[PDB]
Amino acid sequence: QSSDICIVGAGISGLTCASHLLDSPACRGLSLRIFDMQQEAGGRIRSKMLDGKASIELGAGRYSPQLHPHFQSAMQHYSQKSEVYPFTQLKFKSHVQQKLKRAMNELSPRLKEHGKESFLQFVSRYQGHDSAVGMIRSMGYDALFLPDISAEMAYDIVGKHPEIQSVTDNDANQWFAAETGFAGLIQGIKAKVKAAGARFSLGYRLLSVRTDGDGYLLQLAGDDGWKLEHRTRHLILAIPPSAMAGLNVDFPEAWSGARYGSLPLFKGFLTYGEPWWLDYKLDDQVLIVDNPLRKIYFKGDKYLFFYTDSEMANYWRGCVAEGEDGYLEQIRTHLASALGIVRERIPQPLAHVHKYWAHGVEFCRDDHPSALSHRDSGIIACSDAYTEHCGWMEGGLLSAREASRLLLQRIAA
Amino acid sequence: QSSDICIVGAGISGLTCASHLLDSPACRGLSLRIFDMQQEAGGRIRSKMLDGKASIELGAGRYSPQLHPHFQSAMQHYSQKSEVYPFTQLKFKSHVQQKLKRAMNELSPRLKEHGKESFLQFVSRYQGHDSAVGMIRSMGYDALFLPDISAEMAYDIVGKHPEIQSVTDNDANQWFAAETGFAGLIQGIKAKVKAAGARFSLGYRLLSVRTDGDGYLLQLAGDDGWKLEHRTRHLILAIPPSAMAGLNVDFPEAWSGARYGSLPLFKGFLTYGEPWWLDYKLDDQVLIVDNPLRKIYFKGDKYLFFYTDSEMANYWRGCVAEGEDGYLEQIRTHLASALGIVRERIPQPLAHVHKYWAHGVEFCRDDHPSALSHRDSGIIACSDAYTEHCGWMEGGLLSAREASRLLLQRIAA
Ligand SMILES: Cc1cc2c(cc1C)N(C[C@H](O)[C@H](O)[C@H](O)COP(=O)(O)OP(=O)(O)OC[C@H]1O[C@@H](n3cnc4c(N)ncnc43)[C@H](O)[C@@H]1O)c1[nH]c(=O)[nH]c(=O)c1N2
Ligand SMILES: Cc1cc2c(cc1C)N(C[C@H](O)[C@H](O)[C@H](O)COP(=O)(O)OP(=O)(O)OC[C@H]1O[C@@H](n3cnc4c(N)ncnc43)[C@H](O)[C@@H]1O)c1[nH]c(=O)[nH]c(=O)c1N2
Ligand SMILES: [Cl-]
Ligand SMILES: [Cl-]
Ligand SMILES: [Cl-]
Ligand SMILES: [Cl-]
Ligand SMILES: [Mg+2]
Ligand SMILES: [Mg+2]
Ligand SMILES: [Mg+2]
């Protein structure tokens, strides 16, 4: 098993690296092998058909052409149709959400001096700690309570998420979803690189790598235990920092002066025999609540879902572990209390799907190149986490641009 | 959470343990939790639809009512219909297969004095080493070449496998398969155990266990990374010796005076537009050949498959890893040579499925109890590998019987 070029990771980053390399005249005649530990490409892009009826996004779900121009361009390039993503305003504005908008405006002159303190400590200047907790909780993203998220970071974060962007008057961002699922873009890239001669080995997990003369020897394991050795001349690891850390490549110290973190994410989707929420004018609305569901979305008349992070993602995953019936009963209870509705008036679902992402969002904990190189071995690393767009598909696209240029440089050396 | 009784492993052994325990009046009122690292029960019983048409067995495939009475009784108990397994004679015997029958008969008076030497060394007494290799290879089970398989053991092995049992005049054994797949029996046991109150947590891998007072604390990991702790008062590990060795319970030293081994297995199934093998009168026949396919089976007019162990299982898994196209081409090459027909006359398949089992058969290497106990902790271990029926579902049923009695004794103490 040998190749000129090897890419480990068949998410949007790795597949886009492959696209850029195969487009280069400098890679004519070179063989390209792509590994992924999963049996399908896409990584944290994961589209499914809910009850075989509606397409849902278990992973990445939305993008903005204003914020994410490379993604918009890729959707157009592969003829993937977009649709409006409807969850961009908060119709049922609560007092504490209105208050946070006022507080963030009133406090903004203090960002120059005090903007490096935590968002929680900063917002506490408005009316005290307790009022700040109530206000921040109403944004629905529990990461905003982290001590390491500064006020200046949080102001940026709030303005780039569609549900809460009005809180910093960032309403000019439009938000789109995929008409057929972002998996269609993944499959478009995969089919393009395969037509250009890439060979795919899905279901193989890279365990270790070592330099082999001017190349590398990779040790992988199939998901049935089969041990595989692969030799390559040039290597991109298009996997996130948590995955790099599981390898034997001295990540992160040999690659940058930075530390990386991650947070868990959870999504749950439910579909019902009737669109019972139409009676309450909830179609295409999102509710943000002081309640373990946190963010509750009603998609037209098709389905509902909720989206949580950090401790509440872990709460829902623990519930799942205790059993399906208790999990569905807990959703029913929290929906009733969020909607001010009789628990009996919330029906039971016909079908549901959920997904827990242990490292759903990854990020640098601290300047930083968009792709990295191992100081000794020349292996290249590619991930949204190395960019200003960490946690967005746009970031993978940007990292892929840099990673492909670094690999071309090595090839031409 | 917690349980009175916990079983790790939901193959036929673990499920049968649960059934026996839940049938006991001594377990009234007790809670029972069952973990398995896979998302479905069954273990090495794995039934699948080939091209959605016919049911095939990627794992265990046949049993004999004469050799395996508890399995026949379980099929009847759960109303699972059996059908004749056709591959019980060699219609197209080679000369070397005929010669091995003569050799084993002519040498049998030497078994008393010399039966503990290797099968290879013993058969070499007939016409020398080279003739013995030719004869033994023609049985199609490469394990027969191991130095640790004695002549006494091999005579027993040959007489209990359907394709070659005529070599030792064991034609009285009938052989059956499941009309709908042995997965139906697994699901029967599962439904019975679930009705009786057992709770299933599938997709959780046991990582480690330690004693905790009068019970145990289990560390498990979901296949999405979720880490889970479980407390129980009584524990059966219904997993094979290879899986025991991966835990932290000092297997095998703390459990038995014996050592355990394993061999890989591989099955490949192919379906075609036409039953082309009918022209050679091969329907419902098996050929055993000196080529990597080893044992080639033609099932009516429905499909063909091959079944290999040891180095040839690894040969095929390596082929799979190099690519689907090269794997199918290799099958076509070896099929042509085995049938003595030209390669072009072998059509290309419509659909195919395969399965590599890294530890497909597990066995004791060396008066062995049918279930084991940890000398200190009281944990119980259950597996076909601890019985005189290692490698057969019957052995799981026998080990389950003993392991359930060992647990009831612990409960009633
Ligand atoms: C719940 C949720 C919600 C969102 C998002 C994610 C999640 C989980 N995101 C972020 C988006 O999903 C993310 O930025 C990109 O998909 C990451 O692409 P990569 O290819 O860099 O990594 P990604 O993690 O997708 O791919 C890495 C690949 O490497 C493989 N791998 C890892 N280790 C390996 C090994 N050792 N051997 C072999 N293979 C290995 C993995 O199997 C995986 O396929 C998002 N973005 C956005 O734009 N809009 C949004 O709405 C959201 N929302
Ligand atoms: C290719 C092939 C062909 C045959 C056979 C097997 C194979 C692979 N067999 C043998 C038969 O399949 C075997 O004897 C029984 O299925 C074994 O049943 P057990 O429940 O003991 O183990 P089995 O291995 O089935 O179950 C063990 C369970 O433990 C789980 N597990 C392991 N470690 C774990 C951990 N750490 N945490 C959680 N879960 C864990 C596994 O996922 C699995 O579900 C057979 N027999 C026969 O009668 N007739 C035949 O024709 C053949 N032929
Ligand atoms: Cl795919
Ligand atoms: Cl993740
Ligand atoms: Cl012959
Ligand atoms: Cl196995
Ligand atoms: Mg990738
Ligand atoms: Mg079992
Ligand atoms: Mg004989």
Q: Dihedrals φ, ψ of B358, to 5°?
A: -60, -35
* DSSP conformation class of B338: H
Q: Do A225 and B358 touch (CB under 8 A)?
A: yes
Other C-beta atoms lying within 10 Å of the C-beta of residue A395: 25
Nearest CA distance, A148 vs chain B (angstrom): 24
Rounded to 5 degrees, φ, ψ at A320 are: -55, -45
- Ramachandran region of residue B364, left (φ > 0), alpha (ψ -120 to 50) or beta? beta
End-to-end CA distance of chain B: 25
Q: CA angle, A158 as apex, A74 and A278 as ends, to 5°?
A: 80
Please state, in angstroms and rounded to a whole number, the distance separating the CA atoms of residues A393 and A384.
Answer: 7
| Cβ–Cβ < 8 Å for B198, B41 | no
Q: How many residues does chain A have?
A: 413
CB contact under 8 A, B222 and A321: yes
Pocket lining: A162 vs ligand 1, CB cutoff 6 Å: no
Contact B201 A321 (CB under 8 A): yes
β-strand A32-36 against A199-202: which pairing, if any? Answer: parallel
Q: How many angstroms separate the CA atoms of A336 and A327, rounded?
A: 14
Phi-psi region of A284 (alpha: psi -120 to 50; beta: other; left: phi over 0): left
Per residue, what are the HEC states of B139-187?
CCCHHHHCCCCEHHHHHHHHHCCCCCHHHHCCCCCCCEEECCCCHHHHH
Q: Is A141 in the pocket of ligand 1 (CB under 6 A)?
A: no
Helix (H, G, I), strand (E, B) or coil at A365: coil
For residue B299, the surrounding DSSP H or E stretch is strand B295-299
Task: Look up tokens 């039966």; give the residue.
Answer: B115
Task: Give the span between the Cα atoms of B66 and B242, in whole angstroms.
Answer: 29
Check residue A74 and report its DSSP letter.
H
Other Cβ atoms less than 10 A from the Cβ of B367: the count is 3
- Beta-carbon separation of A322 and B1 below 8 A: yes
What kind of experiment solved this structure?
Answer: X-ray
Cα–Cα distance for residue pair B296/B285, rounded to 1 Å: 8
Q: How far is CA A146 from CA A13, A136, A404, in A?
A: 28, 11, 34
For chain A positions 182-241, those within 8 Å of chain B (CB to CB) are 199, 201, 204, 222, 224-226, 228
Which of A1, A224, A323 shows the shortest C-beta gap to B358? A224
Q: Cβ distance A356 to A264 under 8 Å?
A: yes
Pocket test for ligand 2, best of B44, B160, B394 (most atoms within 8 A of CB): B44
Binding site, annotated residues of B for substrate? 62, 161, 307
The token duo for A130 is 């307790």
Residue A290, token pair as written in the block: 């002081």
CA A201 – CA A228 distance, rounded (Å): 11
CA-nearest of A267, A224, A323 to B228 is: A323
Write the residue with the smallest CA distance to atom 22 of ligand 1: A11
The rounded Å distance from CA B96 to ligand 5 centre is 6
Residues whose CB falls within 8 Å of the CB of residue B246, separated by 6 or more in sequence, listed in order? none
A390 CA distance to ligand 4 centroid (A)?
A: 14
Q: Was A307 annotated as part of a binding site?
A: yes
Number of Cα atoms under 13 Å in the Cβ half of residue A196 = 23
Using omega within 30 degrees of 0 as the cis cutoff, is the peptide bond preceding B252 cis?
yes
Give helix A119-127 / helix A95-107 axis angle, nearest 10°: 100
For A134, left (φ over 0), alpha (ψ -120 to 50), or beta? alpha
Instruction: List Cβ neighbours of B95 (8 Å cut-off, separation of 6 or more).
Output: none
A59 alpha carbon, distance to own chain's centre: 6
Closest among A239, A196, A241 to A220, alpha carbons compared:
A239
Residue type, B300: G
Q: Which residue has the tokens 């009789």?
A: A342
Residue indicated by tokens 């037209």: A300
Q: Which residue of B224, B320, B362 to mutate against A (max A Cβ within 10 Å)? A: B224
Cα(A6) to centroid(ligand 7), Å: 12
Closest among A187, A186, A218, A191 to A205, alpha carbons compared:
A218
Kindly give the distance from the C-alpha atom of residue A230 to the centroid of ligand 8, in angstroms, as a whole number: 35
C-beta separation of B53 from B269 below 8 A: no
Largest CA distance in chain A: 70
* Cα torsion angle, B153, B155, B157, B159, sign: negative
A387 alpha carbon, closest ligand = 1
Within 13 Å of residue B185, how many CA atoms lie on the same side as its CB? 30
Q: Which ligand is nearest the CA of B104, by number? A: 9
Q: Which two tokens stand for residue A157?
A: 């974060």
* Residue A200 near residue A34, CB atoms below 8 Å: yes
* Phi (first) and psi of residue B316, to 5 degrees: -70, -40
> Looking at CA atoms only, how far is residue A52 from chain B in angstroms?
19
3-class SS at A63?
A: strand
Alpha carbon B12 to its chain's center: 11
Beta bridge partners of B201: B35
Angle at A283 between CA A277 and CA A288, to 5 degrees: 85
Provide the token pair at A66.
Answer: 């204003």
Cβ atoms B364, B260 nearer than 8 A? yes
Residue A11 CB less than 6 A away from ligand 1: yes
Length, in residues, of chain B: 413
Task: Give buried/exposed letters for A346-372 (b at 16+ CB in 10 A, else e).
Answer: beebeebbbbbbbbbbbbbeeeeebbb
Ligand 3 center from residue A41 Cα (angstroms): 4
Give the minimum alpha-carbon distance from A221 to chain B in angstroms, rounded to a whole number: 11
Residues of B within 8 A of A322 (CB-CB) are 1
Q: Could you give the 3-state DSSP secondary structure of residue B177?
A: strand
Tell which atom from ligand 2 comes closest to the C-alpha of B14: 20
The residues, any chain, with a CB within 8 Å of residue A66's CB and separated by 6 or more, are: A172, A173, A174
- Cβ partners under 8 Å of residue B9, min gap 6: B35, B36, B43, B236, B237, B238, B239, B243, B382
Question: Closest Cα to residue B403, out of B389, B382, B385?
Answer: B382
Look up residue A10 and give its two tokens: 């068949």
Ligand 7 mean position to A24 CA, how many Å? 19
Question: Of all helices (H) and strands (E), which one includes residue A229?
Answer: strand A227-237
Name B109's Cβ contacts closer than 8 Å, sequence gap at least 6.
Answer: none
DSSP per-residue codes, A142-205: GGGG-TTSBHHHHHHHHTTSTTTGGGGT-TT---EEESS-THHHHHHHHHHHHHTT-EEEETEE
CB B235 within 8 A of CB B216: yes
Per DSSP, what are the bridge partners of residue A63?
A: A176
* Residue B311: both structure tokens together: 């180095």
**Cβ A267 vs Cβ A307: under 8 Å:** yes
8 Å CB contact between B182 and B74: no
**Residue A262 contacts B where some CB pair is shorter than 8 Å:** no
Rg (CA), chain B: 23
DSSP line for A248-262: SS-TTTTT-S--EEE
Of B199, B201, B224, the CB nearest to A356: B224
Three-state DSSP state, A352: strand
Listed residue (A368, A266, A351, A360) closest to A313, CA to CA = A266
What number of other Cβ atoms are within 10 A of residue B231's Cβ? 15
Residue A99 dihedral angles phi and psi, to the nearest 5°? -70, -40
Q: Which residues, listed in sequence order, are joined to residue A5 by a DSSP beta bridge?
A: A32, A234
Three-point CA angle A81, A84, A90, nearest 5°? 160
Please state, as a whole number, how many other Cβ atoms lie within 10 Å of the Cβ of residue A56. 22
| Distance spanning both ends of chain A, measured CA to CA | 24
CA pair distance A159, A217, nearest whole angstrom: 45
Contact B394, B68 (CB under 8 A): yes
State how beta strands B2-8 and B227-237 pair: parallel
Q: Is B31 on the interface with A (CB under 8 A)?
A: no
Residue with tokens 């970071």: A153
Q: Are B284 and B300 in contact (CB under 8 A)?
A: yes
Name which of A12, A127, A125, A136 is nearest A74 in CA terms: A12
- Are A380 and A401 in contact by the 8 Å Cβ rule? The answer is no
Q: Could you give the CA distance from residue B232 to residue B239 in angstroms, rounded to a whole number?
A: 17
Long-range CB contacts (within 8 A, 24+) of A322-329: A322/B1, A323/B199, A327/A354, A328/A352
CB B265 within 8 A of CB B143: no
B321 → closest Cβ in A226, A321, A323: A226
- Tell if the CB–CB gap between A224 and B322 is shorter than 8 Å: no
Q: Which two tokens stand for residue B209?
A: 């266990």
Give the count of Cβ contacts less than 8 A between chain A and B.
Answer: 40
Q: Is B384 helix (H, G, I), strand (E, B) or coil?
A: helix
Query: Locate tokens 């492959």: which residue?
Result: A18
Cβ-count burial of B412 within 10 angstroms (0-12 exposed, 13-18 middle, 19+ buried)?
Answer: exposed
- Smallest CA-to-CA distance from A286 within A274, A273, A300 is with A300
Query: B201–A226: do the CB atoms touch at under 8 Å?
Result: no
Other residues' Cβ atoms within 10 Å of the Cβ of residue A216? 19
Distance CA A60, CA A58 (A): 7
In this complex, do A356 and B226 lie within 8 Å of one another by their Cβ atoms? Answer: yes
The CA distance from A298 to A163, in Å, is 13
* Measured distance CA(B240)–CA(B260) in Å, rounded: 10
- Encoded tokens for B217: 């604390």
Please tell me what resolution, in angstroms, this structure has.
1.8
Q: What are the DSSP calls for A273-329, one per residue?
A: SS-GGGGGT-TT-EEE-SSTT-EEEEETTTEEEEEEEHHHHHHHHHHHHH-HHHHHH
Contact present, A380 and A373 (Cβ < 8 Å): yes
Which whole-number Å values give the CA distances from B403 to B153, B197, B396, in the listed order? 26, 20, 10
A1 close to B (CB below 8 A): yes
Residue in the structure block whose two tokens are 């070599």: B167
Which residue from A40, A44, A310 has its CB within 8 A of the most atoms of ligand 1, so it is best to mutate? A44
Q: Which of residues 297-326 of B touch A (CB under 8 A)?
A: 317-318, 321-323
Mutation test residue for ligand 2: of B393, B394, B399, B404, the one with most atoms within 8 Å of CB? B393
> Do A230 and A3 contact (CB within 8 A), yes or no?
yes
